Amino acid sequence: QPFIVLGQEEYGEHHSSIMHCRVDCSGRRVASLDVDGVIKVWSFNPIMQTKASSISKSPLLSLEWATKRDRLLLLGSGVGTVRLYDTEAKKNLCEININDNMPRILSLACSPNGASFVCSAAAPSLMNQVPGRLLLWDTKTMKQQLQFSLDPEPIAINCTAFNHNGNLLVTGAADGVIRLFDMQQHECAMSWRAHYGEVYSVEFSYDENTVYSIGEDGKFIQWNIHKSGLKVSEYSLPSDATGPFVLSGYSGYKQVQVPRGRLFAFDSEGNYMLTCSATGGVIYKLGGDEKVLESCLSLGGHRAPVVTVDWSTAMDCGTCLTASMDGKIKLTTLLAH
Numbered sequence: 001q002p003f004i005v006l007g008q009e010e011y012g013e014h015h016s017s018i019m020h021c022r023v024d025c026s027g028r029r030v031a032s033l034d035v036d037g038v039i040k041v042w043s044f045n046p047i048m049q050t051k052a053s054s055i056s057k058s059p060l061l062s063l064e065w066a067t068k069r070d071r072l073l074l075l076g077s078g079v080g081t082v083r084l085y086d087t088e089a090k091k092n093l094c095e096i097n098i099n100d101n102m103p104r105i106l107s108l109a110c111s112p113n114g115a116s117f118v119c120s121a122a123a124p125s126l127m128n129q130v131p132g133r134l135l136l137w138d139t140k141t142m143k144q145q146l147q148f149s150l151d152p153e154p155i156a157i158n159c160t161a162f163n164h165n166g167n168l169l170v171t172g173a174a175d176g177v178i179r180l181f182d183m184q185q186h187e188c189a190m191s192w193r194a195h196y197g198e199v200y201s202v203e204f205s206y207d208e209n210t211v212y213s214i215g216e217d218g219k220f221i222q223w224n225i226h227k228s229g230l231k232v233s234e235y236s237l238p239s240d241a242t243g244p245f246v247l248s249g250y251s252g253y254k255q256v257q258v259p260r261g262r263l264f265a266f267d268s269e270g271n272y273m274l275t276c277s278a279t280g281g282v283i284y285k286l287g288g289d290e291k292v293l294e295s296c297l298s299l300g301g302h303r304a305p306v307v308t309v310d311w312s313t314a315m316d317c318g319t320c321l322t323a324s325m326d327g328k329i330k331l332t333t334l335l336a337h
């Protein structure tokens, strides 16, 4: 028992499968988005209550909390737009067109220092081996500054993450390639083939000596940031960590969700990792170079596949989100020792 479970509560206001759910930087609000384009913003401590609800007319593909203005949420659409939404005013402050032929805003990342953000913008899917771009913006003006060239070719980027001080951005794409960007020189510092198939999520280790990825080949991999494509470790996760996520009845009728949101998340110092399963969140201890990966805690509580997760740590206490295909989000409260 590395954690004690103080409680599990359910947020049930969504009526469709969850696409993303993310805790804001204060650690006190959730923004969640379902596949019907319903955005919800809610607190959970001490109880769940909804602060904002809106239906998007246009498809929404991505979501990212601002780092230096807690109340602001970036939203990426399926029609080439990025919206700045103010969660206290309950209104879109602006909506900026990506003057391009790439309508799918697959990923948004806000710089730690709050001065910039990046988005991926991809062509329509045909599978997702399609052109995409990586855009850098200025938050103050909400104008694009530049686009990063992608080698060997433009490609849809599924995931982005900054490091702690924001001078590095790691990315994973539909070609299975990880591209790491120096955000000072604005160039690719490093890239390598990471997965057979798409990369779904990427993150810096706490110590920033490695990055972690998860992709379509079922694998969780740790990579040495000081030596391109040198694996540190590699685990085959259970299938239901990476999907595709399937809900059936007897009928011939199924719902299929391909990974879109974050497939893993971490505790404050990155000693533990939360992942999806059919039945709820599954948490593993990192750091080992053991053969099998040490599965230590199962959060449970889901009657439909979990398809995205989050983990925030605030007031010396852990908040885990697990989100399932029935629209249900479980918030599990953890304390360490």
Ligand SMILES: CNc1nc(N[C@@H]2CCc3c(C#N)cccc32)cc(-c2cccc(N3CCCC3)c2)n1
Pocket: 066, 067, 068, 069, 072, 074, 084, 093, 094, 110, 113, 114, 115, 139, 140, 141, 142
């Ligand atoms: C608070 N309002 C606001 N903030 C802006 N930038 C913030 C600063 C910090 C931050 C972070 C972080 N961390 C992330 C994303 C955005 C931002 C920019 C604008 C803006 C920019 C252009 C046009 C318009 N409008 C509106 C009235 C007619 C046109 C408004 N508004």
